Write a protein that binds this DNA or RNA. Structure first.
Ligand SMILES: [Ca+2]
Ligand SMILES: [Ca+2]
Lengths: 218, 223
DNA sequence: TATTATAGATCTATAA
DNA sequence: TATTATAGATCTATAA
């Protein structure tokens, strides 16, 4: 997929270039994953698939030694049970759930940083938060990049948090044929069990002259 | 219901006694609201009902001159569309949705306070966040009071926010005969359309053992 | 009348 | 098996 980046608290210079390369190469090679909506007025319309996207990232990063679902130490258990990925002093959250998760993930990363919790045998120094662009139709209230950017930009204007955060937005060019993975799961909602998966070409149609696009496959 | 409170940034010294009395009396008068779960393997079991509880609070506070769903100003539109209630300088959020909403609600309230957002023709001075105690069985991942307490306590330790916040936890005694409002809605999930509502007798069964902590949630039974 | 953006409701996934 | 705890998925409600 294509990507856009916004950095906070100097993450551009603090983030280890090699660790960033490992995350970036994964995101750039990844096809857009889509599935059918089960929302009442649009059953069957194609939407961004967080399940397939999350699994794709996990399958690429774990073999590169990024530990998945690292447990959060007991002393900070009120902040959660685990973190998506971590390697050395860098935490990664892939966040396609509802929008308040952006501020929950940001604040707990701030506390992980202030208290020096160990990520992967090193104290936490930087967080990477991966999100999807507004351009893709998706479940209602799922977080999107521009909303995350606007929220963190406002927190930065008021000097609210200090931890370095690289915010990543997954995007595609509009009206251009791209690689897509289209999946049908065993149940119309929540299931992560694949029933059918197709690798195809498709595109995101733009009706703008911002509205979200419409995904089509061939 | 009974209430437990935790104040941050001296919300106790800042909160107008009369505004607090209007919120407190409403919450104290309110019976515990329950409904049937549709979660696998516990279909029909009673759980805390956020729909009925939210409606009860709205029906009590609006007549008391609290404004409901106050729009958030354009310059902060990326923080949201509106706030649950407001009266003069006080904002109130009733939060029974999933746990990340606590930090979303805390952080945006911090930003409203820094910029001095008008709430009801007056700059915001304090926020009240209403939550339900852990003791009640409820939808998975719904926010609960002790979790909000522990998170805000950590933020306070690290000086993350300066806005005064009164955190309220709705609770009840265990193994005590209490009145409970039981509501049935037109669909098994998400509906706010009431098909039947009644006040019944019930209690919250304490399922803790010597090896749990008190992290064992209660079981609600009605008669 | 149809979209869209929250806000709120509340399920399943998964491991301890 | 049973349950607790998120974390993630993703719907409906309801007012622009
Ligand atoms: Ca995630
Ligand atoms: Ca609310």
């Amino acid at each position: 997929m294509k990507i856009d980046i916004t950095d906070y608290n100097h993450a551009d210079e603090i983030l280890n270039p090699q660790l960033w390369k490992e995350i970036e190469e994964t995101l750039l090679k990844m096809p857009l994953h889509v599935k059918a909506s089960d929302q009442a007025s649009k059953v069957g319309s194609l939407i961004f698939d967080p399940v397939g996207t999350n699994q794709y990232i996990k399958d690429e990063l774990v073999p590169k030694h990024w530990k998945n679902n690292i447990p959060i130490p007991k002393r900070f258990d009120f902040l959660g049970t685990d973190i998506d990925f971590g390697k050395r002093d860098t935490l990664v959250e892939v966040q396609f759930s509802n929008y308040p998760f952006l501020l929950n993930n940001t604040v707990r990363s701030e506390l992980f940083h202030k208290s020096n919790m160990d990520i992967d045998e090193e104290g936490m120094k930087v967080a990477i938060i991966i999100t999807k662009g507004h351009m893709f139709p998706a479940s209602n209230s799922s977080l999107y990049y521009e909303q995350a950017q606007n929220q963190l930009n406002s927190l930065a204007e008021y000097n609210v948090f200090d931890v370095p955060i690289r915010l990543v937005g997954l995007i595609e060019d509009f009206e251009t044929d791209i690689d897509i993975v289209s999946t049908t799961y065993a149940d119309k909602r929540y299931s992560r069990t694949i029933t059918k998966r197709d690798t195809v070409k498709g595109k995101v149609i733009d009706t703008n002259t911002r509205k979200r696009g419409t995904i089509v496959t061939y």
